[PDB]
Amino acid sequence: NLYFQSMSIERATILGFSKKSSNLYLIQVTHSNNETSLTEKSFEQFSKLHSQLQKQFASLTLPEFPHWWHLPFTNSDHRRFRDLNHYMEQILNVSHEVTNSDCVLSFFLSE
């Protein structure tokens, strides 16, 4: 485990929907060296990431996955953006091992 790296992930934020499809969230990832990259992910892909992290990090306190069944989540784009933003800022601040895990890096740094 390497600490204090450059291309590791610091933050990730929703810019809006992808131009390819509004089923995909356009996410800007800021690396530790302050360079940015973009990825596009569906809600199902966020769900799968969370599921994987729960299995891999059984002893850590992970953040709550968004409550998608609340009506504003279904009806409001901005609600979904806010909830995913809050999820991402928490999931990148659990531990070094979570932030630098293969599933987190693969999620954020893939197209």
What does DSSP assign to residue 86? Answer: H
Q: What is the C-alpha separation between 78 and 71, in angstroms, rounded?
A: 13
Q: What is the C-alpha separation between 95 and 111, in angstroms, rounded?
A: 24
Buried b (16+ CB within 10 A) or exposed e, 35-67: eebebbbeeeebeebbebbeeeeeeeebbebbe
Tokens of residue 34, six digits:
């302050």
Resolution in A: 1.2
Residue 26, phi-psi category: left (phi > 0), alpha (psi -120 to 50), beta (remainder): beta
Method of determination? X-ray
Q: What is the C-alpha separation between 49 and 67, in angstroms, rounded?
A: 16
Look at residues 71, 107, 67 and name the one whose alpha carbon lies nearest to residue 88.
Answer: 107
> What is the DSSP code string of 36-73?
EEEEEE-HHHHHHHHHHHHHHTTTS-PPPPP-TTSHHH
CATH superfamily for domain 8-111 = Phox-like domain (3.30.1520.10)
